[PDB]
Design a protein around this ligand. Structure first.
Ligand SMILES: [Mg+2]
Lengths: 346, 165, 368, 249
DNA sequence: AGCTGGT
RNA sequence: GUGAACCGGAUUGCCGUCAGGAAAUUAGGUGCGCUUAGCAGUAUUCCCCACGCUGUGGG
DNA sequence: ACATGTGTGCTAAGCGCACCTAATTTCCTGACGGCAATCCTTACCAGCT
């Protein structure tokens, strides 16, 4: 019953060639051509060369299809200098290539579910290094997206698939152009006088011989059948770190462990202890292991806050065990003793 | 935000001796003098347990030092790139306008800690032009997120918008 | 076999290089502004250095006919020389032409003055220009020559002018955020007047930065373009080492006499060179302890650690050197004890690198 | 089975790929202009030198490679230069040269590679373990020699920092991680922010194989959690080469 | 005797 | 594998060369921290071995 | 990054400032230098293989 798979063409660069390229100006078209997705199809089966001409192009040449523009990518031109007889003589051959940049597409393939069922297990697992119609243009999205289903008409299938969104505040095309083939509703029907001819229909493959086809423009506004999709997936890293946990339930109980592990005493300037300091801020602590804290008296923990609050805040901590952060701690404690105003709090 | 407003209002409560010792700590971190750290702790600790959103610590320390040095008053709608730019229209475009303009653009490519002296010269020419109001809350929450380029470009476009009018 | 020479130089407030508008050069390395010194300025200052004078043997001139006319007491050949040059391929007084100095002087003088021809005279002058490869400054910096095809003769040809550069000087990237500073100067009118003002109020921009300077010698290329000899090659390598450690770019040094010396040398012998620019992708922000030079050396030594273990090349180890004068600035302050031959001199490292080059000594080679 | 060498590569300021007028080449992605080197340039740079030749079945049955255009993780920043060639012979005035302008860009790149099962076995050359030997050469030969360019005046051969190798068989480039160009926040590096973006994309898509991860002396972890998003946070030269060798066979 | 690099 | 393959835009470069930001300045005048206090005390001193049950080894 | 280690036993209330104030003149650079090629032919002809 699922008669259609929605091919997902999306990458940094892509190009399906137009007809106006025999010489060094090689161009593309503003739609994935029929033999610009059938080449992907033939690569996805793992064959190529002259095998596609028989039983692979006519195996679906009787089958209509439609394409959708998620966003119209702009046309980019890349300089390309073929070296000819250089890595004949050093005469450098010249060229220019056309690239469609940042364009997403959605092709339909409708009519029957046996070939679509064979084709559904052809996009993800079977490969012959599939790309976006150009050999050096990678598909940036899983092509096997948009799972198949029954939607009887071309517009229903082409509009009954959710439309993605990359970031939240992103402009979205409210009109989605649709490229559709010609439907012979009755025998002897003549094409409407707006249907341009596209020459994307191979009858052989190597060397390329071609047939033309009729292409009908069509339109799709968002809202009636197509709609935006859930985005999620935060593209903002900003390295994580918790902070400011007085007590959930596991600070009351975990302060005492190093309080009386060190026998109710300080560690640097040994004396009756009050509080606990934290070293190795890998996690600021909702769940704290008992080999990282440091039960330590009031004045030298105030000196620890001296040294931490000044200069960098960071995630590296003091660790008053290795004697390189010693003179500063004692000096700060000395000015704490000399200059603390208890009546002015803290 | 409902957290930075309390910080600015508590800063406006500070008496002469406290902001004097804050004035003496220009360009100096909050460690080499005990009373400066004590004042900063008193100003900075109690606003985290009452409201869930607080500014960054370095932004708070720098803003406290600059506030003590300059002593403006808090008024909505008086951010830096409006008064800046308003004073740039009162200039000769030939020579002095590029001078003051480059002095302003120096801020857009600096990290939070090193902006004490460029903000000092910007607020010095603001004081020379007799500016009393400065949106300390607005400056603080555009400075605590100064590392994202949208707010920097919005601040610059605010300067452009105030300059063309 | 190719030699890497790395420096970390802190400089006084100076303007060693400017663009057309007069600003110090800047590059956007790692998403932040880094102060830049152009490679060509360093190459030129090392070319004109006071120790290269025994080896300075290249001339980049368009006034070749002036050079011919200078060494002729009474035989005025300056229009004939000009037309010989004008049909050589240069079309005007010409474009810039690179060659050896004394060779072109004497033998272009002898090949130009004789009244034996005008077409073949230009052809042999062009051949003398093209064969002028007996100079190691041309061998280091590199030179091509392209004459016109319009203002020439169909009977005048040009040989292959292929000379590869045996030196890849990198641009000196600052080890931190560039802080470009604006200098305001006036020009005093010596005589007085009514106005009591300046003769010229002007604009100058200066930048104080710790520059990561980076050079690289292709010694194999240095001898494949300096013919079969190696004595001149070793002399040039020693001369560059002395010059680079001893000379500075001749920018606004009369106004900013920043003649400070490189506080770091890293010479490592391998067949795959590396710049420690990624040692300072993170900008170096100083702390209260230590200084900018030590923090930069610390980040550099961290990078040397994970490219000597993570990117280890123990098939060809590092022969990493230093110029730590009596160990003032050690590299391995925490873990990186891989400096195999940390010394505190300059002639010692010169002699050492020419020793791993081959069987040479510093004093014997210094005669070519 | 398919090999995806997702590779990051920072670059010190230097121009590498030049168009007609000499600019660094550019691409369009994520609604911004980003710097670009052409896939032909880097693919020829993988050839034409003997250090990699230590391979004619792989860049010629045609050839066996999918090399993508080097999409910058951030916006393009093209700069310009100004050179003066001196006269060095004293004339009546000073200055003689072309007095032209050059131009350069410093960027952090990304690329994606593809070597399939039969695309490496039918490559063959003469062995069946060659289908592991050549790949094992490749996984660090792709990060062996930066191309070429104006290196004699802009010396830049910065080795890469963070290298992915995946054995997922479905060919998908992770360029959608760089839909938003990477901004810089003071506490992390540009390469570290880009690697965090790559990690953040890695934790996605698995919802709807392994992660073989390279970090030299593991300075860059793929996720700041014990639940590592690659689970193979190791790597040292040919250890990864041999591990891919006995991953394939 | 033809061929190929130059005009 | 496909209007698609396989594919460099390459080499040569000092922006240099002249520059006081100088002339002038009271930081000004007003102010109480202050009302209240034994560092003493036998009738269980928290203990553990430990005495004819208060001497005896210490936490 | 106040709380939590009380240990015979650790108070506390009233009180916290107003206003005049910020100036100008003029001064600001001339010249010299700016790349050539090579990315389809009036195609046969003679140096010589
Ligand atoms: Mg203590």
């Amino acid at each position: 019953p699922p008669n259609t798979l929605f091919l997902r063409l999306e990458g940094a660069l892509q190009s399906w060639g137009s007809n106006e390229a025999k010489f060094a100006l090689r161009r593309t078209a503003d739609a994935p051509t029929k033999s610009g997705v059938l080449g992907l199809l033939c690569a996805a089966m793992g064959i190529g060369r002259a095998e596609a001409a028989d039983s692979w192009l006519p195996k679906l040449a009787n089958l209509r299809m439609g394409v959708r523009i998620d966003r119209p990518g702009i046309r980019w031109w890349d300089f390309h200098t073929v070296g000819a007889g250089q890595r004949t003589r050093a005469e450098t051959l010249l060229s220019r290539r056309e690239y469609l940049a940042d364009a997403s597409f959605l092709v339909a393939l409708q009519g029957e579910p046996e070939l679509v069922a064979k084709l559904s297990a052809a996009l993800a697992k079977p490969v012959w290094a599939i790309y976006l119609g150009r050999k050096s243009c990678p598909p940036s999205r899983p092509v096997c997206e948009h799972p198949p289903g029954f939607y009887n008409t071309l517009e229903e299938a082409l509009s009954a698939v959710p439309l993605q969104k990359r970031w939240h505040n992103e402009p979205l095309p409210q009109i989605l152009p649709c490229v559709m083939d010609w439907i012979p509703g009755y025998d002897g029907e003549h094409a409407p006088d707006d249907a341009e001819i596209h020459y994307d229909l191979p009858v052989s493959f190597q060397p390329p011989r071609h047939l033309p086809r009729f292409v009908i423009r069509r339109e799709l506004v968002v809202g009636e059948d197509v709609q935006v999709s859930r985005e999620t997936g935060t593209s903002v890293w900003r390295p994580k770190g918790t902070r400011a946990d007085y007590n959930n339930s596991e600070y009351k109980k975990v302060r005492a462990e190093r309080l009386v592990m060190d026998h109710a005493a300080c560690m640097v300037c040994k004396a009756p202890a009050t509080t606990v300091q934290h070293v190795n801020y890998r996690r600021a602590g909702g769940k704290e292991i008992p080999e990282d804290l440091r039960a330590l008296c009031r004045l030298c923990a105030d000196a620890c806050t001296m040294l931490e609050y000044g200069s960098g805040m960071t995630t590296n901590r003091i660790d008053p065990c290795d004697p390189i952060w010693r003179e500063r701690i004692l000096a700060k404690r000395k000015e704490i003793v000399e200059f603390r105003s208890r009546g002015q709090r803290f | 935000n409902r957290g930075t407003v309390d910080f600015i209002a508590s800063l406006e409560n500070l008496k002469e001796g406290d902001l004097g010792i804050l004035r003496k700590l220009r360009g100096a971190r909050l460690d080499e003098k005990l009373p400066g750290f004590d004042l900063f702790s008193a100003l900075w600790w109690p606003l985290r347990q009452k409201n869930q959103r607080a500014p960054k610590r370095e932004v708070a320390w720098l803003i406290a030092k600059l506030f003590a040095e300059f002593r403006f008053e808090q008024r909505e709608g008086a951010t830096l790139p409006i008064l800046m730019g308003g004073i740039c229209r009162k200039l000769e475009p030939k020579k002095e306008l590029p001078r003051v303009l480059a002095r302003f653009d120096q801020l857009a490519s600096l990290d939070i800690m090193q902006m004490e002296e460029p903000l000092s010269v910007i607020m010095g020419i603001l004081r020379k032009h007799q500016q009393v109001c400065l949106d300390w809350v607005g400056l603080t929450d555009v400075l605590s997120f100064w590392e994202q380029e949208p707010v920097k470009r919005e601040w610059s476009d605010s300067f452009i918008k105030a300059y063309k009018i | 076999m190719l030699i890497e020479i790395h420096m970390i130089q802190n400089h006084s407030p100076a303007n060693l290089n400017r663009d057309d508008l007069g600003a110090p050069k800047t590059c956007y390395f790692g998403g932040v502004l880094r102060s830049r010194i152009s490679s060509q300025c360093i190459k030129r200052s090392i070319r004109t250095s006071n120790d290269f004078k025994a080896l300075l043997g290249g001339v980049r001139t368009r006034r070749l006919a002036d050079l011919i006319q200078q060494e002729a007491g009474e035989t005025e050949c300056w229009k004939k020389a000009q037309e010989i040059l004008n049909k050589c391929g240069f079309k005007n007084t010409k474009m810039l032409v690179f060659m050896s100095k004394d060779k072109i002087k004497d033998l272009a003088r002898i090949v130009l003055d004789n009244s034996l021809g005008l077409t073949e005279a230009a052809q042999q002058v062009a051949n003398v220009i093209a064969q002028a490869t007996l100079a190691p400054d041309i061998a280091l910096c590199g030179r091509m020559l392209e004459p016109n095809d319009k203002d020439k003769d169909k009977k005048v040809k040009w040989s292959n002018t292929t000379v590869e550069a045996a030196l890849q000087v990198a641009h000196a990237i600052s080890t931190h955020i560039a802080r470009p500073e604006i200098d305001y100067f006036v020009a005093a009118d010596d005589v007085p007047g009514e106005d009591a003002g300046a003769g010229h109020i002007g604009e100058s921009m200066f930048a104080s930065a710790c520059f990561y300077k980076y050079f690289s010698i292709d010694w194999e290329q240095l001898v494949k373009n300096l013919k079969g000899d190696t004595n001149l090659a070793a002399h040039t390598v020693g001369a560059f080492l002395l010059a680079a450690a001893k000379t500075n770019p001749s920018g606004k040094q009369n106004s900013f006499a920043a003649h400070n010396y490189p506080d770091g040398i890293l010479v490592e012998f391998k067949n795959s060179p590396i710049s420690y620019a990624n040692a300072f992708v993170r900008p170096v922000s100083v702390v209260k302890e230590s200084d900018l030079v030590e923090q930069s050396i610390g980040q550099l030594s961290n990078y040397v650690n994970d490219i000597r273990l993570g990117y280890y090349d123990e098939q060809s180890p590092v022969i990493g050197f230093w110029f730590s004068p009596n160990n003032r600035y050690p590299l391995g302050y925490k873990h990186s004890k891989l400096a195999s031959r940390n010394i505190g001199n300059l002639n010692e490292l010169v002699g050492a690198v020419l020793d791993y080059i081959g069987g040479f000594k510093w004093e014997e080679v210094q005669k070519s």
